[PDB]
Structure 1
Amino acid sequence: ASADSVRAYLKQIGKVALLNAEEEVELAKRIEAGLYATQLMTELSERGEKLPAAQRRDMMWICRDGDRAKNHLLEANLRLVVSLAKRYTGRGMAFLDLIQEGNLGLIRAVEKFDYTKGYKFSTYATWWIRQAITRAMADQARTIRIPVHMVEVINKLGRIQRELLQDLGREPTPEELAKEMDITPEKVLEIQQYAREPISLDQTIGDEGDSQLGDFIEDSEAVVAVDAVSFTLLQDQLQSVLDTLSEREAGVVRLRFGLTDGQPRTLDEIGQVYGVTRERIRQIESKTMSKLRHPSRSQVLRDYL
């Protein structure tokens, strides 16, 4: 089978021989020389030079040799990436994705780099690789993406609550944790509420594998059937009652409450389209409302409310 891509990868990365500070200095010098060489080739390419054949040929050799050295060092330290990444499994992301993100962090560490400080590569890279793995595990782990500042404070709360659970024996209280972390209890509660892991709708709530949670969740947003027909009836009854009003009255009501287009017109607009003052509109409004409050045309529409 050999289906384990973990193995398909480890047996692959066990090939390239491991290097030392001596070869590291040589490699870094070659990489830097190549990057400088390609920078100058780009500079002299623009508006520039009909280069000598030997000079041009071997500076291209340097340009490619720098990439060879870069890739050689990357292959050399893949093993280091694995050794640093193994410790962040058992939770969240999967091992392979972590290895790839740690590889990205390693590209960053070798890129943004220096050797004149006279330090073995791992010292500096370890920091970057750890940072990259943590960055990935923070962003691309939880389904609902929670950003990294919130993630770090979540982890600090988790550590404090756990350690003080063991220290106290009893579970810490929200004020105990709020005082410890020098934050407020409502913030403690908010963070705890943000640590909740979305359960899966795919779970055998029954003992045998036939009953799923998704088959017992009333959707409290569906059409109530009776509510929709009731709204249609309300539309009809209200339309009739308003038609009992006079033309001016029916118009003012419909426009004032947007029964004709869904746009609620206000007093100034209504007075403008009727060519009167808004005080007159408000008076017609009050008169009409009082007329409708009369039980004759009121009790018909009471039930809908």
Structure 2
Amino acid sequence: SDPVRQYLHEIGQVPLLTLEEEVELARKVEEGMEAIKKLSEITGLDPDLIREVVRAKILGSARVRHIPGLKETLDPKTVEEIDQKLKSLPKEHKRYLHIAREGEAARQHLIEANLRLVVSIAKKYTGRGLSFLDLIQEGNQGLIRAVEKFEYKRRFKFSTYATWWIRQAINRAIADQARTIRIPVHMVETINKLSRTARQLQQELGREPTYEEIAEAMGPGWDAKRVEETLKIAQEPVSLETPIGDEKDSFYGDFIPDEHLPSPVDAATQSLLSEELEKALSKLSEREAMVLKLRKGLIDGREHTLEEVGAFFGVTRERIRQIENKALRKLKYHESRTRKLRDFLD
């Protein structure tokens, strides 16, 4: 009924590995990877395709899907076709198939037996914007990376190598997913640096530092202006549903106007402006209105400058610039009488 408690119970069902057991599983995974490489040469296939086919039979029919990068939809037909070419190999070649299968099996057990390690690292990273289980799942992702890269020959215990990859995965998770406005991982690193720096500066000075005091402490390249711009970028958004007051009946979003949609006054104004504009180009001449109207466009916006204007106005090409002026000129005289258009300048 408690999702953390349930998961803790499930990990506790896989016993921890002995030094021997740890080395045994690790050994089988490495040999299996080498087996798949060799199986590629012999067969003329793809090492990844073989690996997904080998892996499919260990986990069972439960998981069958297209894998991003694989050339074949990885449906029961293709895994049977390809598995039958692998089981049709001679005894000395076919020994490598058995190796790959057992490699994958040991990998599963190795991962499962180390899940408690991830919990003990993730619990220390709580409170940074990802839920505990989100931290465990990202931590588990690194553990998978660690199992694939582990070299057992170095005689190191597994826990030593895994921890680097698990710590790496959680920290990348926090940097990627914690913000409504996503920030590049490197930029998040810089922001955190300013925080630590200012926090030191406040501890020696007994008061808040200025932008200038932080810019000095950050070294060359930093002025006060850049510290401020960085802080502006680091601002997290706030919920529209944030309550205002002790009565539970007021939201912040309710105090925010909608600036996009035209207001009744403005919508009214736009209709009235189009109506006076066309009822104005026709009171000189429609044709000198037709030449001018094409040079801007009512609902289109057809302003180039000199080329395009070569085609259909009705004249050749320099002339349209001139009738643009007499249209604009007669409009200008005609405007002083019907000075109703002055007020639309706001």
* TM-score normalized with structure 2 length: 0.79
Looking at both structures, which has the greater relative contact order when contacts are Cα pairs under 8 Å and sequence separation is at least 6? 2
Deviation at residue 82 of structure 1 after TM alignment = 0.8
Among 122, 147, 150, the alignment partner of 1:110 is 147
Kept in 2, the 8 Å contact 1:21–1:121? The answer is: no
Deviation at residue 54 of structure 1 after TM alignment = 9.1
Q: Whole-Å Cα distance in 2 between the matches of residues 252 and 46 of structure 1?
A: 71
Is 1:303 the counterpart of 2:301? The answer is no
Deviation at residue 301 of structure 1 after TM alignment = 1.1
Among 170, 179, 182, the alignment partner of 1:145 is 182
Give the equivalent residue in structure 1 for 2:60. none
Structure 2, unpaired ranges of 5+: 46-84
The CA deviation string for residues 24-65 of structure 1, in whole angstroms up to 9 with x for no partner, is 322221111222234434544449885456984x65443332
Give the equivalent residue in structure 2 for 1:93. 130
Deviation at residue 150 of structure 1 after TM alignment = 0.7
Aligned length: 302
Give the equivalent residue in structure 2 for 1:254. 293
Relative to 1, partners in 2 of residues 1:266 and 1:194: Cα closer, same or farther, differing over 3 Å? closer
Relative to 1, partners in 2 of residues 1:270 and 1:122: Cα closer, same or farther, differing over 3 Å? same
Q: Whole-Å Cα distance in 1 between the matches of residues 30 and 140 of structure 2?
A: 20
Q: How does 1:144-223 map to 2 (within 5 A)?
A: 144-182=181-219, 183-223=222-262
Kept in 2, the 8 Å contact 1:268–1:277? The answer is: no
Among 122, 129, 140, the alignment partner of 2:166 is 129
Q: Whole-Å Cα distance in 2 between the matches of residues 63 and 247 of structure 1?
A: 84
Deviation at residue 137 of structure 1 after TM alignment = 0.7
Q: Whole-Å Cα distance in 1 between the matches of residues 151 and 297 of structure 2?
A: 70
Among 19, 32, 35, the alignment partner of 2:33 is 35
The CA deviation string for residues 207-243 of structure 1, in whole angstroms up to 9 with x for no partner, is 1211111222111223211111111111111111110
Deviation at residue 156 of structure 1 after TM alignment = 0.9
Is 1:234 the counterpart of 2:273? The answer is yes
Among 17, 20, 27, the alignment partner of 1:19 is 17
Deviates more, 1:226-235 or 1:272-281: 272-281
The root-mean-square deviation of aligned C-alpha atoms, in Å, is 2.4
Deviates more, 1:67-76 or 1:231-240: 67-76
Relative to 1, partners in 2 of residues 1:17 and 1:274: Cα closer, same or farther, differing over 3 Å? closer
Q: Whole-Å Cα distance in 2 between the matches of residues 104 and 275 of structure 1?
A: 70
Relative to 1, partners in 2 of residues 1:6 and 1:194: Cα closer, same or farther, differing over 3 Å? same
Deviates more, 1:44-53 or 1:9-18: 44-53
Q: Whole-Å Cα distance in 1 between the matches of residues 39 and 299 of structure 2?
A: 72
Deviation at residue 277 of structure 1 after TM alignment = 4.6
2:7 aligned counterpart, secondary structure = helix
Kept in 1, the 8 Å contact 2:118–2:143? The answer is: yes
1:304 aligned counterpart, secondary structure = helix
Amino acid at match of 1:110: V
* TM-score normalized with structure 1 length: 0.89
Relative to 1, partners in 2 of residues 1:176 and 1:199: Cα closer, same or farther, differing over 3 Å? same
Give the equivalent residue in structure 2 for 1:224. 263
Amino acid at match of 1:172: P
Is 1:287 the counterpart of 2:326? The answer is yes
Amino acid at match of 2:153: T
